[PDB]
Design a protein around this ligand. Structure first.
Ligand SMILES: N#Cc1ccc(COC[C@H]2O[C@@H](n3c(NCc4ccc(Cl)c(Cl)c4)nc4c(N)ncnc43)[C@H](O)[C@@H]2O)cc1
Length: 377
């Protein structure tokens, strides 16, 4: 039967199939190749993906996301304590493990992380089933290289709930290396720099005659594109207050509209130097109309961009590597499209040019689908 490839990310998932010798990254029911990893429990309905994410503004306690931060961890882990103080939905201690508590028709309902991740996996399964016109029972699913056995098993258990046998767990750096087709012959050391919406991971991957080994990994669990958007949000909220005596934070719908336009503006500024951020009646009778330049975008985020080098230094130090010891730099995650990110990486490595894909958001799912193809022969 078919084996599909799923990137189960922190902020999103992505599903690919291997069919007639080509990988096809599949569109969800809204036409998007990336699906936000959100699940909403509002008014007796359960939504998964973009429709769930839209519930977060008005139903923040009922809109579950970032469950990958909890999966296979313990409630008292330092990282989980920090995530409970950041996340707006209730997290409870179930026999030492974090569980998610929501209401369904007013009833308290408690889910293991893998039950929420299963709902994401079921949606990816259904996309694949509709496209292949046949049932899917098997998948390759990606994990972070730093995932321990409990985190990998909880991910497999998410698959089993979704009716997917996870025939192989591959780490995200290996998935990237397969996607970019890095030559498997002889020995190659690769720096995989993965800057997503919520998280930053960097790994040293060694490929030795077809055998992939991650020699070192480091990152920042709370550094991604969402943080760069928030820096912009913060600035324009201060400016709108200075000019108009309106604090946009007092209206959650206004903040939601601004965040959508700021995200688009950031993406524009990876290509152009100046963009307009425009919302008619951001509150009643008050338009939002601003210009953001690439220079000001960079100025607002310079410290966060340069923070990404701290984990790069750590993996080189952990592996006892010279910068020169790295043979190729590979970028994954949509945030690696920011020109300043590529410049800083290039300059840290004493001029060396990074390799970057053209669809860096899909590279991991693409490699998972390649691994599916490899397993079927
Ligand atoms: N929840 C959720 C969710 C929604 C979209 C994405 C994809 O992006 C991961 C990160 O990558 C960032 N990013 C992206 N990602 C591309 C992208 C954005 C939205 C969708 Cl639906 C898809 Cl097909 C792809 N492009 C960027 C660009 N041109 N310049 C700077 N940052 C860019 C994006 O802003 C985000 O922070 C990830 C998760």
């Amino acid at each position: 039967g078919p084996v599909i490839g799923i990137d189960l990310g922190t902020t999103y998932s992505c599903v690919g199939v291997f069919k007639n010798g080509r990988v096809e990254i599949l569109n969800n029911e809204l036409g998007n190749r990336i699906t936000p990893s959100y699940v909403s429990f509002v008014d007796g309905e359960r939504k998964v993906g973009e429709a769930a994410k839209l519930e977060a503004t008005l139903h923040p306690t009922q809109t579950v996301f970032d469950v990958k931060r909890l999966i296979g961890r313990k409630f008292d882990d330092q990282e989980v304590v920090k995530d409970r103080s950041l996340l707006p939905y209730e997290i409870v201690n179930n026999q030492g493990k974090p569980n998610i508590k929501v209401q369904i028709k007013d009833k308290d309902t408690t889910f293991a992380p893998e039950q929420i991740s299963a709902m994401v996996l079921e949606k990816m399964k259904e996309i694949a089933q509709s496209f292949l016109g046949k049932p899917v029972k098997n998948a390759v699913v990606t994990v972070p290289a730093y995932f321990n056995d409990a985190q990998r098993q909880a991910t497999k258990d998410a698959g089993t709930i979704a009716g997917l046998n996870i025939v192989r767990i591959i780490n995200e750096p290996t998935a990237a290396a397969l996607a970019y087709g890095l030559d498997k012959k002889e020995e190659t050391s690769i720096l995989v720099y993965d800057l997503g919406g919520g998280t930053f991971d960097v790994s040293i991957l060694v490929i030795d005659n077809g055998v992939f080994e991650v020699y070192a990994t480091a990152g920042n669990t709370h550094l991604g594109g969402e943080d760069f958007d928030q820096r912009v949000m913060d600035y324009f909220i201060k400016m709108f207050k200075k000019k108009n005596n309106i604090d946009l934070r007092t209206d959650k719908r206004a903040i939601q509209k601004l965040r959508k336009e700021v995200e688009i503006a950031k993406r524009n500024l990876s290509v152009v130097h100046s963009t307009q951020i425009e919302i008619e009646d951001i509150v009643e009778g008050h338009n939002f109309s601003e210009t953001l330049t690439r220079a000001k975008f960079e100025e607002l985020n310079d410290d966060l961009f340069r923070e990404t080098l701290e984990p790069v230094k750590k993996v080189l130090d952990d592996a006892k590597y010279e910068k020169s010891k790295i043979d190729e730099i590979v970028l994954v995650g949509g945030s690696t499209r920011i020109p300043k990110i590529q410049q800083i990486i290039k300059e840290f490595f004493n001029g060396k040019e990074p390799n970057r894909g053209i669809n860096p958001d899909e590279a991991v799912a693409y490699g998972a689908a390649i691994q599916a193809g490899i397993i079927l022969g």
